[PDB]
Symmetry: C2
Subunit: 37 residues, 2 copies
C-alpha cells in the first residue's frame, strides 16, 4: 500500500514544522519565563 | 524508487524521537535556567 508512504511523507513535513515549533515555542514561552517575574 | 520511502519512514522514527528530545531538552535546560541563579 503506497498510501502508508504518502502519509509517511506528509507527516515528515508536518514533523519538521513541529520540531521548529517546539524549540520556538519552548523558546518563546521560556524567554517570557524570564521577564515573567 | 522505494528507497526514498524507506528513508521517509526511518526519518519519521528519528523525528518523533527528536520532538521529544527538543521539549525534554529545552525542558531540562530551561528547568535548570531557574535554579541556575
Amino acid at each position: 500500500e503506497k498510501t502508508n508512504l504518502e502519509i509517511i511523507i506528509l507527516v515528515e513535513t508536518a514533523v519538521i514544522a513541529m520540531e521548529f515549533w517546539l524549540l520556538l515555542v519552548i523558546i518563546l514561552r521560556t524567554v517570557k519565563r524570564a521577564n515573567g517575574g
